[PDB]
Amino acid sequence: MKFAPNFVFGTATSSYQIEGAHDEGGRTPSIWDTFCDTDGKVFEKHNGDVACDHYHRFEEDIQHIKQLGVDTYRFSIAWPRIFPSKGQFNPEGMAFYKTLATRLQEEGIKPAVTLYHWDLPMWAHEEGGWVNRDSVDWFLDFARVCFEELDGIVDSWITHNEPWCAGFLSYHLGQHAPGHTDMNEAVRAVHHMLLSHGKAVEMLKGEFNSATPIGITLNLAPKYAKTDSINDQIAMNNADGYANRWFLDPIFKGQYPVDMMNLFSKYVHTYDFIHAGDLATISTPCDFFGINFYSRNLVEFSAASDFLHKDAYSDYDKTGMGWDIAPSEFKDLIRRLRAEYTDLPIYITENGAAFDDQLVDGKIHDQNRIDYVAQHLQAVSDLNDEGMNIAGYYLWSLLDNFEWSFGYDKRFGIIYVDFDTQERIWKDSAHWYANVIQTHKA
Amino acid sequence: FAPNFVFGTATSSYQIEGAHDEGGRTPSIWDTFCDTDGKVFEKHNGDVACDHYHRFEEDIQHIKQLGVDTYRFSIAWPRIFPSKGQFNPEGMAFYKTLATRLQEEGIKPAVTLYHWDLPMWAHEEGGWVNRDSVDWFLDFARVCFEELDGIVDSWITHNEPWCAGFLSYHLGQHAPGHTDMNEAVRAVHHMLLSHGKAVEMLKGEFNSATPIGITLNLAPKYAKTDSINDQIAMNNADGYANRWFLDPIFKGQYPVDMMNLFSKYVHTYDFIHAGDLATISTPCDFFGINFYSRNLVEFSAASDFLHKDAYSDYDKTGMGWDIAPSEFKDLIRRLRAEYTDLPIYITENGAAFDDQLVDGKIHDQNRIDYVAQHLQAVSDLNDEGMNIAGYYLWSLLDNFEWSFGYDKRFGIIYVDFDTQERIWKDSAHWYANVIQTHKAALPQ
Amino acid sequence: FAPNFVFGTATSSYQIEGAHDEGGRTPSIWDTFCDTDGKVFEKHNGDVACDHYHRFEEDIQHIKQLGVDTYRFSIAWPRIFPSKGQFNPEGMAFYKTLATRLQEEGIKPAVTLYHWDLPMWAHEEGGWVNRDSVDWFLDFARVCFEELDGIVDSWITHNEPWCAGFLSYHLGQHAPGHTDMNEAVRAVHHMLLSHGKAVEMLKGEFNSATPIGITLNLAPKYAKTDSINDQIAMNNADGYANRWFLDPIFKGQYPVDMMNLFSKYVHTYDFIHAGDLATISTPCDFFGINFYSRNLVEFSAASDFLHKDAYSDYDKTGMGWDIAPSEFKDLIRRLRAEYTDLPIYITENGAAFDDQLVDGKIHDQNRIDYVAQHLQAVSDLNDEGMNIAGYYLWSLLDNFEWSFGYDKRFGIIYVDFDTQERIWKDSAHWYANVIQTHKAALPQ
Amino acid sequence: MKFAPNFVFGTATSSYQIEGAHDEGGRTPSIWDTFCDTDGKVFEKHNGDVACDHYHRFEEDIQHIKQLGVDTYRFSIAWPRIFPSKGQFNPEGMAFYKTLATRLQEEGIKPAVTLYHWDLPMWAHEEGGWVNRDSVDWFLDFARVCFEELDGIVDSWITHNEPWCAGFLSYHLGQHAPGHTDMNEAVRAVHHMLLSHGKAVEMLKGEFNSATPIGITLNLAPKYAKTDSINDQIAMNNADGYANRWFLDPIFKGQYPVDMMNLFSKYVHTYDFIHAGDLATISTPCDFFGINFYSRNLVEFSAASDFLHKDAYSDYDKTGMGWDIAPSEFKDLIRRLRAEYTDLPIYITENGAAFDDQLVDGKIHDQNRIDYVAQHLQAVSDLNDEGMNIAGYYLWSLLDNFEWSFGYDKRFGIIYVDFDTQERIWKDSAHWYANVIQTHKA
């Protein structure tokens, strides 16, 4: 495990998962506030009302981040804090992020700032949300004030976090807010996310004339055929198209994959929501490429599935989410990206694991989480020996937090959080990560 | 309840028998499915189960002490034809003895021919997807009729073709675990046609008057809202669960709304031959219903069949199923209005809850309450003229609950699967007392 | 025929009027469709047509000499509202004069409001796909009612929504020529709802007793063989052509078998709002039927709607359509058994044949024979109590036959489109004599 | 117009379209005999009972071919003459083809022999025809006796003619025999045709140890988008997949195009009829590549079409089939094939046109057919100047003949045939073609 002196270590969070203060500072509800309150959607109707109370306790968390010695803190800006109503900027909301980023710079920590990490304002939802092509303009007005007020104190920008989740998981499979099950809505939502990404990049580099590094973050889950049958090859292909190529191709090639457009045409009977110039804008050149990586999926064919695939039995070790622990597949992915897609510097903007953490005598001996991270850092190092140019690794997450549809039932943090008292207790993985970074610095 | 109302309790062969490779028994599709990775909870299987093949006398005594009029069980096809065309007298002898012993104790044997244990040899030739499955079943039913018709009180041809057909060949959750809608409609068709042919054989060729019928699981479907989309959703859920089976049996046709919907996958219906539906709808003596719950549903634009489950605020069993006795009543009234005047047996009803053994007892007041509510509904329905002739409580014993393995307990008698000890739960004592109370109300 | 049976003849505005840019008229979807390459035979159009807007007096005299009780015509929406919200008195004056003149000659005006000439301004806002089309139509119907209700004998709201909806927005053969099943179901819905709302307006707001109804083209469907696949095929052809329209109008619902089939393309039905179907099914005074032929169909595994045309050995018209008077009778009997007791007008029936002008005459014995057979069928049906109150012969004049242009002649009067000369075909003389003969049978 | 001395000129026919003698010499009916007799399927129930009576008049036709001066005569062998019943070889049927090819060699004319040109025996149809994987073996037994008895006197072999027609037009669109409309049957039929091709090639080169040149003939119709909209791009893609790539990819890449497998999965819910090794065999190396080329298609998107496309309005000059005259598109095609698919030598195994031929004073002044051929020969010459290696051109057809579902209503011949009397009358295009070949020979 050897990293170039240039390599950045990071840790990451998002606004709705940690901030709390959900109705303070002028903040109006997001699609996730109301989704948490919809029956059946979130584990035990858990919500982000209080979360990690980070809005109030940000100073303490800055100290935790300082003590880790990470070069970089990745966080998101709450859209509903900045534009709590349409066209109505909220200076109090912007002040919190201005302070946050100023304070991080003062402590010598790079702010890596995600603009959209899933907390769409309810007023936007009420007009059709991401399905409405106007969402692109709503997003640009949000990005514009962010750039006006923060570009000078931010180290890098990430436009969108996981449009597969915000698009497909949210509007097709109905597991994430706003919980719809409509493939036409989903492809329109994704398209508008990606186009909003491209336009914000053009805005930053054109009219702001800024050289701040900017890119998108995609979650990528490499897909494997259970057998070598032709059916299972189709299945892998289609799982891969649905999770990965539907996003990679527009961003890097300026095209959607026609094989997936044909498969999606069981629901989507026109593609005229893709206007001339959209794909050129989606593929506007960026400074780096962000990857959230958690696992692979083994799949096989299903004659009864619209998209011709279903999950297959996996015999791998699994995290407490039930996801495969899959570092070799992480390496397959990165090689593929370099062979097929891009030469840009890569940041692993998220990697991490939930395990059934046990608090005993004020400690958390999360050897399982240590083993997970160690394997993936090892893989990064080895990939960097092949010239794969992974510029950095941000560990998800700084803190245990609101894990979406699972609520507080799933802990991804290297720092444990008692959600009653708000106490932070470093897990063994925090102590170990701090040390790994220090060893690299020598 | 009426003086001729029957109280019962129910099991099936693979879920209780064990002795999976004894007495000439060869593997069923469930034996191999249990061994297929990812299909059954912790790869649990029916190798031992409740070891009933060995302990049947003990279980008979349990049945006797319960005071039930009826014991419903199934015949393991792989015990009877362990290979194609090769009858196994030792397998039949177990069932002949079982039924004789029940009669000797004054208990009516209600016998299910097919409760899901298709022989592997049949599966290896295409299973229920193959139209020859009708003849394979017929040969099975024929020898059962030859050897047992004199000793059984009633016959049930098929148990839950929605499960054996759709859950098994379309949704892949039950053996053999396929996910192919064309296989699944062919499978269901052959099961229903096999039922029709078995009833014709019993009444024509055997000239027997033994009551015979089919058992369907029926799950009434409700719309979340009154929007037309949600009405379409309820229509299609109800077609998929219920009407696909009820229409052929009682009307001699398949519902064309569902044929059209299924034509996203099924591009020909020529597997339905001339005469098939006339045979499927051949007249029977009763209609068996397995009832557990309702489903509340709504529309989904991204679903092939236009529906998905909607959130339910009902009290639920340990399966997460709604406790839905009012909906049971809507179901029974609907059947009388739209489908049949035949006498109805509730061939299964019951519940799984998280049973705790404490100081040798099982305080399953939740199961008691579940059953009480449905018995009350039966009684009420019978006051309306709805002619429910009996109720069989699923199940006598905790047993192998399919893809959930031994993790879900439906028994009124607890079974410790390490020791095979039977321990009566509170629900067993209570059920025995409910039957006594009903008998004490009748004039002797 | 009965003493109050009416004989008629029929046209529509765009097919005969001409003067396409005069009198304030702005273009319809057909004007622009005729100019779109590949859509209409030799890019023929309705610029001149039969020049009836100018020659109406001559045509009235022709109608008078025929002796018909009724003349059915349509009102050009682009003459009345040439722009959204801008009423055009000069356009209305033509129709006021026309109807007044018909009355003065003792001829009943049967008036079609929508016969396919949607204004381009409406099309540019989404046409019939837009729910606002209901209000646009309503404003059109309102002024027609205001200005003409006193002078018209009956109203027909819509002519052939299967054509205006499916043939136009799904199969792309008629204006505006789209091929989108979601547009097509929305279009049909808005046409039917517009009908319902217009009838409510006439009877509620205008408090008028003028008879009003809708006109559907209906094409009875037959299976090539008795296989279930061919039965499914006939079911789906009949749903697509007929039941999609009959069920909402007479039953207040859309057929769910067809909703399911159409869900290969249509993934939500929330364009049907609360109240829509109650309004669509509002009671009317008669039911209009345009009848031309049957279709024999069979199954096709490769067709979305599971059917295709089957070979027909029937005698055929110059359109290649079956000559099918027996099937006309099955249709009318079926309507009385399953849908309605309302009086029926045959608002169109007729045929195209390859007419030859020779020495100033047209010997169309083929058209005579076609019409004779259907008139005989009407008479026979009326002896059975089937209550067909009238028959309107399509058409008075050879005219613009849509995507076929002037290449197909349905008139009983021949029109030389170079000179505008009208020449009575043998069928016109014969029809006049048939009406005389019927009048001479009645006691004066 | 200059052709290498090596360039071969040809003319072409097929057995059922010219032979007649339908019930003589032991010949049993083909799927086309019975299709012609099925109501509604063929123009005026025309059939090949007599056709051009070539079975009897072959000597005269050899003389016509001689007089043309063509290097090559392309013809087909009637399967129902060779195996009129399953497993029952018919020496009388083989003798006619042995004589035919011996006589052509004696006159110094290369026989180019098509094995399957659409006349499947009714006994094969009765067992499921090309849908049945056993069709591969039935075909091999036919090919085997052909090779045994004819390889020594044949100049080249063509395994199959237009599997798009024999597969898709015949089993999906129902326009050709046996007239089915079933997409599952169609893809199975095609697959078995292609696999039978590959196996026959392996047989010829392995167990026969023969070096006779062998290849497949595909009809290829290049596809063009009406506009530059994304929808119309999808439409072009799918028209191209359906007509061309579904055949080109297996043959040259050993794969089916997954975009078309996904689109076809509206009807075809499993692809396990493609067994391991099938695609390797389908793509077995061949000596040349045969192209039947007639036209292009301009297409546009349709939301109501399963395969997302429909024909668009064409303003090009058209033949009497209504097909575009499209030589520039012919050149697009050949360039593409060299850029994307193959370097093998190409034979244009069919090119020609039907026009409303007028017989006046014993002549046929078919200037329209001359102009058509001239443009395409010109295009071949120009392509050969770019190094596109078109080794030869066979003009369809030697004779007016039975044009399938159009019967005798469509005349593709350079030699007119009175079908009452059987008289052959050279059209002006015959005289012109003869002369073009002679000019090349100088």
Residue numbers in the entry:
A (entry chain B), D (entry chain B): 1 to 442
B (entry chain A), C (entry chain A): 3 to 446
What do the authors say?
The two crystallographic structures of EaBglA, solved in distinct space groups, presented the same tetrameric arrangement. Structural comparisons revealed that the EaBglA subunits assemble in a different way from those of GH1 tetramers available at the Protein Data Bank (PDB), indicating that the tetrameric arrangement of EaBglA is the first of its kind to be reported within the GH1 family. Hydrodynamic studies using SAXS and AUC indicate that the EaBglA tetramer is stable in solution. The tetramer has a 222 symmetry (with a distorted tetrahedral geometry) and two pairs of active sites placed at opposite faces. Each pair shares the same entrance and forms a huge cavity [11393 Å3 ± 216 (mean ± SD)] with a two-fold symmetry. Two types of interface stabilize the EaBglA tetramer (called here α and γ). The type α is a side-to-side interface composed by residues from the helices α11 and α13 and the loops α13/α14 and β8/β9. The γ interface forms a semi-circle wall at the catalytic face of the TIM barrel, connecting the active sites from neighboring subunits. EaBglA crystallized in slightly different conformations, as indicated by the structural superimposition of the independent tetramers observed in the P21 and C2221 crystalline forms. These conformational changes result in variations in the surface area buried into the tetramer interfaces and in the volume of the active sites, suggesting that EaBglA forms a flexible oligomer, which possibly contribute to overcome the structural rigidity imposed by low temperatures.
